[PDB]
Design a protein around this ligand. Structure first.
Ligand SMILES: CC(C)NC(=O)n1c(-c2ccccc2)cc2c1CN(S(=O)(=O)c1cccs1)CC2
Lengths: 11, 222
């Protein structure tokens, strides 16, 4: 779950 | 009455990251050019709401101390505030960012997206209510930060850590009201009024819910 949200927050 | 060097620094950080965001030209062209249908208008709102979540994550990352929070609480804060942040930014765009004639075309598309009037009516009422307050950019930026850094969202492991981040923002916002509106000692209470109004939109939104963007599906838990 929420893989893209995790990607945006850590990028 | 004046902001301490600490409150000034904290305000300057919020302001800088808030001004960084803007509406894409690629979206603006769709508002002007795309066909006027319930499917096409719903597709435009989907594009706008997705762009907003991306802009909301960039703003949130830069919030003083947000990165010092537990990685899981950072996600629960983003998920809990996404809907409220969308309605507050929507109010800003409606009262500011759009040209007189283009806003009419956008309103025409928001009212013809296949969404029920029992939801569209309190939405425009909310924008109108925000418009009445004649909020400065600092107020929009501080309200958005207070919304994101809410210690009372579901699934937060360390709420006290969040309280420590939000309380200084409420202190800055209250002091700005005393400085710029000393003749209106109810100005701060009016802004808190919009915070409670914003929270009803969480209930309206869940009841409001064509499959959406992955960024939307995840941040809304649908
Ligand atoms: C640009 C952001 C801040 N606002 C936005 O996209 N709006 C606006 C709006 C209001 C004023 C100016 C510009 C835009 C009205 C509505 C939405 C999104 N949806 S949604 O998220 O429920 C939705 C997503 C997909 C299908 S419906 C609610 C209806």
């Amino acid at each position: 779950d929420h893989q893209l949200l995790r990607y945006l927050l850590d990028k | 009455m004046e902001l301490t060097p600490d409150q000034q620094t904290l305000l300057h950080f919020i302001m800088d990251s808030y001004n960084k965001q803007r509406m894409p030209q690629e979206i603006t062209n769709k508002i002007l050019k795309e066909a006027f249908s319930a499917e096409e208008n719903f597709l435009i709102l989907t594009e706008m709401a997705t762009n907003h979540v991306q802009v909301l994550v960039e703003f949130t990352k830069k919030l003083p101390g947000f990165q010092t929070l537990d990685h899981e609480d950072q996600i629960a804060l983003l998920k809990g505030s996404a809907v409220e942040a969308m309605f507050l930014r929507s109010a800003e765009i409606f009262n500011k960012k759009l040209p007189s004639g283009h806003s009419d075309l956008l309103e025409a598309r928001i009212r013809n997206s296949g969404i029920s009037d029992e939801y569209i009516t309190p939405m425009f009422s909310f924008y109108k209510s925000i418009g009445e307050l004649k909020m400065t950019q600092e107020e929009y930026a501080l309200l958005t930060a207070i919304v994101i850094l809410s210690p009372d969202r579901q699934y937060i492991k360390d709420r006290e850590a969040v309280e420590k981040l939000q309380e200084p923002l409420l202190d800055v916002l209250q002091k700005l009201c005393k400085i710029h509106q000393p003749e209106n000692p109810q100005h701060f209470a009016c802004l808190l009024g919009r915070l409670t109004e914003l929270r009803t939109f969480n209930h309206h939104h869940a009841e409001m819910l064509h499959k959406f963007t992955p960024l939307l599906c995840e941040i809304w838990d649908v």
